[PDB]
Amino acid sequence: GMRRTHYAGSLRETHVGEEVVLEGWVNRRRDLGGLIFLDLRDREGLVQLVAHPASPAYATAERVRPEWVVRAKGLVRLRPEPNPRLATGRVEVELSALEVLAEAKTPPFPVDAGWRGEEEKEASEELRLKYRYLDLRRRRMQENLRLRHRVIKAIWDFLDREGFVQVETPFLTKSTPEGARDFLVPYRHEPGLFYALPQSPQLFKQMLMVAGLDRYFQIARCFRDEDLRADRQPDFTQLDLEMSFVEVEDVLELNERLMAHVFREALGVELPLPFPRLSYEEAMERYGSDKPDLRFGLELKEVGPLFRQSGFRVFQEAESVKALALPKALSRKEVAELEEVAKRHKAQGLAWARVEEGGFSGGVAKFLEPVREALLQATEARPGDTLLFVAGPRKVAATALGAVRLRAADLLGLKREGFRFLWVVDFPLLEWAWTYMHHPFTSPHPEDLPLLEKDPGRVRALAYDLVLNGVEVGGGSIRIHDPRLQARVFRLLGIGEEEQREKFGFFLEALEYGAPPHGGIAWGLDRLLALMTGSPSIREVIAFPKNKEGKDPLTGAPSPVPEEQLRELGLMVV
Amino acid sequence: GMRRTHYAGSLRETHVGEEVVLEGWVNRRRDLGGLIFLDLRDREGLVQLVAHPASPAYATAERVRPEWVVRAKGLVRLRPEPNPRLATGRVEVELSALEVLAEAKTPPFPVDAGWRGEEEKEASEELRLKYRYLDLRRRRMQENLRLRHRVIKAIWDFLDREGFVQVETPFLTKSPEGARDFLVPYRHEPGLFYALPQSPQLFKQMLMVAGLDRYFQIARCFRDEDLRADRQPDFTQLDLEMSFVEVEDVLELNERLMAHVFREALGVELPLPFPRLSYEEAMERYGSDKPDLRFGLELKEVGPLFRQSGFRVFQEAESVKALALPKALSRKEVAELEEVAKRHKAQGLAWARVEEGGFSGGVAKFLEPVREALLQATEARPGDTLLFVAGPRKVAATALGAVRLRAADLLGLKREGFRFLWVVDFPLLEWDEEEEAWTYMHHPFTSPHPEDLPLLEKDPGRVRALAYDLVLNGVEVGGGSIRIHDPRLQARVFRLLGIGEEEQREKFGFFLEALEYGAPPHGGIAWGLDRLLALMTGSPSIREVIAFPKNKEGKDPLTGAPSPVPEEQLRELGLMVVRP
Ligand SMILES: Cn1c(=O)ccn([C@@H]2O[C@H](COS(=O)(=O)NC(=O)[C@@H](N)CC(=O)O)[C@@H](O)[C@H]2O)c1=O
């Protein structure tokens, strides 16, 4: 068997009196009172080793240095005083033997403080990525990676119990000129031909429903060679799933129970069910976003129809006037910062006013007094608040004041805690010619089918987004299984026969052989884990990620190849 | 909730009298005396629907054709005569309602036979791949994929229980397992490329440097080989790594894991521990480093019997290996084995017959002078045929071992069950008989045996490696080794393999630097998961246990990959096709 008797970090008072053998890294060394203290570290935590002057390990303990790998033997003792910041804090190991297994260069940054429960100074992320195998020694990074393990295992446990079959889908597949750019892989035996890496398993998982597997899932890697700004990696991980004979309700319900199972098992957090749901229209009206942050209130209110007779022209003529009531009297500085956030979101401006005990004061207060009783019942605003207004087109006014609403939350120092999930449902199928939102296999709402040709902009889709704390962590839809309806959606989009066969030919032919009703979703697993850990970037929950620019400082990729390796592929640099 | 009350194939006599809602595919339609019988199919199997002319469901049922998708409602009743070949064969559904959810045209090959327990006729595999979403409707293919699910889940349960951390490693990484890399052009700077990983080898060793102690991953590996021998461009490994381990610790963990997998996914008990054979023992006794232990017919060294022989072809040979087959082969069969032998670099195949007192046929004359010792060494009996290959030891073993494997087929030996074994004590270097060179059997991060370190510069050919292969039924299903964790020794071994300091820095500099920060002792292994599943299902190819595999030339008939890309796209990458 193994030489070690225990993980170093697993020792407790229950082990006092046992002789242990331990292996790990020297986290720190201190000399006090003629004793040598060594913090010995492995993935379960630190344990204090003590070398006494009479001990055979005494000279060895004096020469070891941080990050050296050692094997220690000794007997577990109570400490005279416990250190409650260590789980092993009640005990130490009186060293009888100490063996050096590997020496170590001084690391470019410290990895020792977190394991003592101390705060860690921020290091250059580029330096952290270049030495990622050392960055991953830190307690924080190992907790992230081990949480990711527990989340995926919980997903397997749940979906296996519910009858889902995990199926692995191809990585070398068909390159299509459809939409986002593919990463290409040259085919050596015939220069000029390429595989593509998959943007998602969408077509394969739908074909698995056509194959009768009923329900599928995969922890899937997706590859999209597009703009890497906004915390995007060249590849990322989805929890991808698909089910047969389901309505929207069936997919949402399954995903709610799965998410609650994951949070209970991997985080010890209880998620109340069911999740709240908002239509896309309700979300835009009340929050100005299709990914609302429900950790605070401050909803937007439509007040347009209050000023239809007011002398204030810019309110009276606007298609929409949105109002927001902040529970604080803001400075002229803060208002202008909010106004700047509004104008940077295409608004014409941000009107404002303070709410006093008898009326209003400041900004547009004069034009608000005639409609005071109605304005206050609509906004539920109390004396001391500050009213913010954005007038303009309905989508612009909502989106602008919604961004004002988010930035306002920071200015007021609102406590934003916990995990607030919600479903956003009833997205529009299209948008102005006409174009779809995600992919063209999303089913129209059955009761909206006749509007497909008459009023396409009002057709709802059977599509849904999963949002957590203002972040889109999942998206999917019920699919079209009728090839006649799919052709009908293509005719509405102006997508001809030759273009369909070039982009989707093999799948459109699959629908002719009896596809069941089906639908599904994919989570952004990296985004979920970053939110679960309070990380500012998904790079903190990926073992070996790229930097923000898409390169890998650890290995040096992407790198040149010898021209003989490229000539063998029949390609050359132009 | 769902409309569906049960899976169609799950209905039993215990459900008689219940009203059920079912959804699935029409496996077959038969009309009889005005009744319409529909075998409804889903992933749990078939159940018989009955549409009566007086039912509201009848008009719908008249439209239905095979492979149409329907939702059916009605009452479970006993059949007047049961179909004992079906799990639902005692019952049927008397239809009260039926709706068509989807129509279907006639498939290019049948998918209905296996769901009835009947045998499936062989279809063209290129056609099966072109319509893989229909091929996957067959019962055997769904059994394969659901077994694959069960195996992976069992792997997760066992390794999670044993403290392994699953870590997902990169797919877009730096341009090492004995094949060519698949490249990915970097769009923003033409001439730069990523490589797809041939394995996660260096990432999992770095996770040991990071102190995670034990890792695993169900990893996809990409290797651009001449795709002979049932090669796919990418395939799947159970990859794992452990810290502070010796060879034995890795072997015992994998043994217990494999027994758990076979018990939970197949209901098969694998006796423990697995047999172990050294590389030398395996080659001497079986002429192969992946022995097939499902039959006997071991090889015997008889060189020391011919040192006084007039037969120069025997007398000069380093080795003469013999094998006794329990049958009097025909001259046609002997020439076949001789051809097998010659295809494996042998100078030829000798033969004879064992009769009640003397010998007959082939080289029997030269076998007669040495009879007592030969019969004791081979245990041959009257009616047997003796075969010999004379030559260098490795040649003689390998040629007659391939004859041994072929002969098992000619004799029709019943080879059954699952015979695992470890092959251990591999040499660090393998001699290429062709290119007359030393090459490494396992990748360059394999640790030499610590007792053999002074032989690295004195005599590299006798250096043992701390490497091991896992063999199942004559197939290599796993391979691994204890790694080098000392940076000086890793550079020393790179120097031995003909890799100068310039080459070390360019390909492995980041990893050599990592060894300088306190790398623990570590080792690991990787299973060929597709290979394992193919053996577990008796499949002739790993294509039968992969949902959407390539064909033998690495092409995807279903999607048309690989394919040209627009001239505009290729321009954006800054590359062009070289003109012949
Ligand atoms: C980092 N990163 C990205 O760069 C892009 C996406 N995602 C997350 O993937 C989810 C699904 O992706 S999708 O493109 O919307 N739809 C799809 O991929 C569809 N195939 C899903 C379906 O219809 O079932 C999003 O909701 C995000 O949470 C990221 O995490």
Ligand SMILES: Cn1c(=O)ccn([C@@H]2O[C@H](COS(=O)(=O)NC(=O)[C@@H](N)CC(=O)O)[C@@H](O)[C@H]2O)c1=O
């Ligand atoms: C289809 N296919 C192939 O094309 C190639 C390999 N394999 C299977 O992968 C195992 C490990 O692969 S290895 O390259 O030997 N070692 C490695 O990849 C080492 N990195 C593992 C280690 O040292 O821990 C083999 O034992 C086969 O069972 C296939 O199934």
